Amino acid sequence: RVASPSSELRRALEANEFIPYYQPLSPGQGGRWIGVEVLMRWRHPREGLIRPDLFIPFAERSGLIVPMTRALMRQVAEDLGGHAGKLEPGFHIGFNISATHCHELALVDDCRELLAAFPPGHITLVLELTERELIESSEVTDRLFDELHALGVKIAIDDFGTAYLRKFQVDCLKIDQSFVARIGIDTLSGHILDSIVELSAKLDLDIVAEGVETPEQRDYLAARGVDYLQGYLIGRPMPLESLLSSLTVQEGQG
Numbered sequence: 412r413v414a415s416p417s418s419e420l421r422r423a424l425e426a427n428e429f430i431p432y433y434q435p436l437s438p439g440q441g442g443r444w445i446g447v448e449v450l451m452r453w454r455h456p457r458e459g460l461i462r463p464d465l466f467i468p469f470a471e472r473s474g475l476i477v478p479m480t481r482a483l484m485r486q487v488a489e490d491l492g493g494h495a496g497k498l499e500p501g502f503h504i505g506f507n508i509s510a511t512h513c514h515e516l517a518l519v520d521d522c523r524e525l526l527a528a529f530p531p532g533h534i535t536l537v538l539e540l541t542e543r544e545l546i547e548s549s550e551v552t553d554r555l556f557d558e559l560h561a562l563g564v565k566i567a568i569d570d571f572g573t574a575y576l577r578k579f580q581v582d583c584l585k586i587d588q589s590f591v592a593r594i595g596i597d598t599l600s601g602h603i604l605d606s607i608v609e610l611s612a613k614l615d616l617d618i619v620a621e622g623v624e625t626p627e628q629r630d631y632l633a634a635r636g637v638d639y640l641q642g643y644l645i646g647r648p649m650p651l652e653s654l655l656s657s658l659t660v661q662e663g664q665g
């Protein structure tokens with residue numbers, strides 16, 4: 412017999428094969444990067460550097476998604492806490508969190524630990540949860556979000572648009588790529604996007620647009636006060652080495 416996907420993931424976790432890639436966040440009006448989104452990559456020993464996408468569902472059912480995320484959080488602290496000079500005060504670091512992680516208070520501890528790797532207030536830690544994940548967690552989010560907020564951690568709604576809004580105290584809305592993709596393709600698409608942006612402003616929330624690929628999209632978004640942009644226009648997820656190099660180039664002109 413052969414070991415299941417979840418068992419293979421466990422072996423990979425114990426051998427430290429899950430590693431962070433870093434996708435840059437840019438201001439809406441341009442300028443130096445203001446943060447990164449952390450992506451999970453698997454340097455598979457015999458199948459090379461990959462995305463564990465097909466494996467994520469298995470990690471969710473087993474629970475292993477939580478310790479996988481923790482291992483990423485620790486590797487980020489190791490990677491970036493020793494280059495905090497290349498990081499402007501306030502630099503955002505965003506993680507994709509799972510619903511399971513919101514049980515008990517482990518997430519508080521995990522964030523404390525990451526924050527301790529940088530000077531107090533030096534980075535802004537952003538935890539990203541989908542609408543679905545927040546609804547799955549509604550019994551715990553009142554207290555959990557209070558403890559995380561107390562530490563200066565922010566909560567973003569991931570893939571937004573993909574009455575419960577009054578059930579959760581969040582900091583940021585991330586506009587799903589599907590909406591950005593349709594900028595210009597038809598007038599309507601836009602109205603709906605305009606409504607999401609305007610809803611952010613009503614609620615005093617920051618806004619990130621995902622999937623920013625063209626200058627037309629960027630300009631449309633920036634004209635409406637979108638705070639932050641992510642997507643191939645700004646940069647693909649990159650290894651640490653490439654991130655530090657780019658950050659060097661940017662201090663270099665500032």
Ligand SMILES: [Ca+2]
Nearest residue numbers: 507508509541
């Ligand atoms: Ca998630």
Ligand SMILES: [Ca+2]
Nearest residue numbers: 569570585621
């Ligand atoms: Ca997303």
Ligand SMILES: [Ca+2]
Nearest residue numbers: 621622641642
């Ligand atoms: Ca993106």
